[PDB]
Design a protein around this ligand. Structure first.
Ligand SMILES: NC(=O)c1ccc[n+]([C@@H]2O[C@H](COP(=O)([O-])OP(=O)(O)OC[C@H]3O[C@@H](n4cnc5c(N)ncnc54)[C@H](O)[C@@H]3O)[C@@H](O)[C@H]2O)c1
Ligand SMILES: NC(=O)c1ccc[n+]([C@@H]2O[C@H](COP(=O)([O-])OP(=O)(O)OC[C@H]3O[C@@H](n4cnc5c(N)ncnc54)[C@H](O)[C@@H]3O)[C@@H](O)[C@H]2O)c1
Lengths: 329, 329
């Protein structure tokens, strides 16, 4: 029977149960490159838990490899070129946690408006009278600016408009304006207009060379001093040093972050010392439902390629013909 | 007890209908009128729509127990999605099941235009073998192919025409990264006008949207080379067919190959039937045994998923999911 290497465990054991019905699996925990190499030589499939890496030199050692599956959308730590050259199919598992991240985003937007973690701290310390200096924000009729109108951004736009009564603006050069109009948002060609008009700005872009450090001191200066930033996308989209300067200089009023750069944020991180800051440890997409759906998807696609069936989320379909040559024909 | 499912046209493989019959009672209509749909749709929980059959808003409103509409393939232009969304009805498509088939069919049509294959077959069979002394077939090596829409099919067509024929491949698609073209040896161009000026064959592979509706009109044909050919396997409404006929008459382009039409099916007296260097097929580019089986299984399984309250993989109106929940309980 075929052998599968799991570079990191899946998000739900049901995916490992699926593999074990037909394959012999070995599981490594944050393995070093050497540990991968001595475990990968006889496997037909590999699962990679984000953010683990799979290098070209390791792929070359896997002479019978048929398929590499990642745990989520991201494949940046996979050398796809190497896999393609050897007839190995790379699949991702995208969109398995859209609803979880959308809910987490609504949670952070509301908690910023209501000053919820700060008020909880104050009441528990006997500082009930903080209420005199408080002005919670009503979300109704405020403006939300969505940067990245993808799977998550679209759902967040829809619910903030329909359920919370917000005006919703969006910036995304790589979707048509009709996509925003369908959910009640307006797609804007000029990011600066969204920045000037928004009371809450929520980031939902893919991380690319173009969006890396896109949210820097120049952007924060354009935002309203009363506005808040929410980032549930990727830590590298935000320049954290500039963000701290912007909070310190009151260029924006606060922020909620689920992702960081560097990740694991340092014990030193100056962002910890603002009470208009709300932090979560990269959990926005983590629910039992999302973990199970991704684990089952990844296992099912590995099993498809081992059977010779085309999986639904191939990242390198240009490899199929060589895959055919190596393992069929 | 069993839910009812209406098929507005058959699937292309019986496997889908057998999957549905395990758990539901089905009725199959053959090219029904709007009235026949309304009679058969009143009590059904799920509908399958075989393209180009239409499902209009008025019919969706009569379907008081409707949960899910599945299209036969990627295209959803024959569905009133807005009406479905308003009623808490999930729309699923079935994308990427015909990608190799359409890419093969597109290469077939490019070659047949270059070699004048249907015309010459007719000549030999009518006794005019000696037409050969006036024929100059085109050598595809180093000719330029322009791809409009670098999606699943457009990217595979670019890859195959490079590998099989040595063609230079240009692409126009505002919504994909230039790296996607580079990976298959093509160049992504920001200005469609440049692609039109440089291409010897222009092949259409876009989604039909308000932006691509009637994109290929007389102004575009005036920009194409008089020696160039148009290939359309995407959607008929991307091409203004009356302008295409004008363009062929006025020698703005040399010929065309079409698998999709507007009016689809086309009329008995369509003027395109009478032109030189026209090659037509009846929306069969994506209809192979392999593709039909995959699409039929996918459509059946998504219908069954939604009937169970499970989120399917190809929801095209995810903003409707909460209203579906509210009705499905
Ligand atoms: N915090 C978590 O636990 C978690 C979980 C899942 C996803 N994510 C991240 O959240 C982000 C959104 O996820 P998704 O599934 O909606 O992605 P998606 O691929 O569906 O959408 C990404 C969108 O970003 C847009 N984009 C690219 N460049 C842009 C630019 N310069 N400006 C504006 N928009 C741009 C793209 O056009 C796309 O519509 C991603 O970064 C994803 O990695 C985080
Ligand atoms: N038998 C057949 O003829 C057959 C079979 C399958 C699919 N199709 C059709 O072929 C088309 C492509 O299918 P696919 O699976 O590759 O879809 P896809 O979603 O993978 O690709 C469509 C591409 O169109 C591009 N697009 C959107 N707007 C554009 C614009 N203004 N200009 C240029 N490009 C734009 C998108 O960005 C996308 O990359 C669809 O119209 C589909 O309905 C036909």
């Amino acid at each position: 029977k075929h052998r599968v290497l799991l570079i990191g465990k899946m998000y739900d054991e049901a995916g490992q149960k699926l593999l074990e019905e037909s394959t012999n699996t070995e599981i490594l925990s944050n393995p070093t490159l050497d540990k991968i190499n001595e475990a990968i030589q006889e496997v037909s499939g590999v699962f990679v838990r984000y953010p683990n890496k799979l290098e070209a030199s390791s792929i070359r050692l896997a002479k019978q490899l048929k398929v590499i599956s990642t745990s989520g959308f991201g494949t940046d730590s996979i050398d796809i070129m190497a896999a393609t050259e050897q007839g190995v199919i790379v699949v991702n598992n995208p969109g398995m946690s859209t609803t979880a991240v959308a809910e987490h985003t609504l949670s952070m937007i509301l908690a910023l408006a209501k000053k919820l973690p700060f008020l909880d701290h104050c009441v528990k310390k006997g500082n009930y009278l903080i209420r005199n200096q408080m002005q919670p924000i009503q979300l109704e009729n405020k403006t939300l600016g969505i940067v990245g109108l993808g799977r998550i951004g679209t759902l967040v736009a829809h619910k903030c408009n329909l359920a919370l009564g917000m005006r919703v603006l969006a910036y995304d050069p790589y979707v048509p304006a009709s996509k925003a109009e369908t959910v009640g948002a307006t797609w804007v060609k000029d990011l600066d207009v969204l920045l000037a008009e928004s009371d809450f700005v929520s980031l939902h872009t893919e991380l690319t060379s173009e969006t890396r450090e896109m949210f820097n001191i120049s952007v924060l200066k354009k935002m309203k001093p009363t506005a808040f930033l929410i980032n549930t996308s990727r830590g590298k989209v935000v320049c954290e040093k500039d963000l701290g300067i912007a909070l310190n200089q009151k260029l924006i009023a606060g922020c909620a972050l689920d992702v960081f750069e560097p990740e694991p944020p340092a014990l030193d991180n100056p962002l910890y010392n603002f009470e208009n800051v709300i932090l979560s440890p990269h959990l926005a997409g983590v629910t039992p439902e999302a973990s199970l759906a991704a684990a089952v998807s990844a296992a099912n696609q590995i099993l498809q390629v081992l059977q010779g069936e085309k999986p639904p989320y191939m990242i390198n379909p240009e490899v199929w013909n060589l895959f055919h040559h190596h393992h069929h024909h």
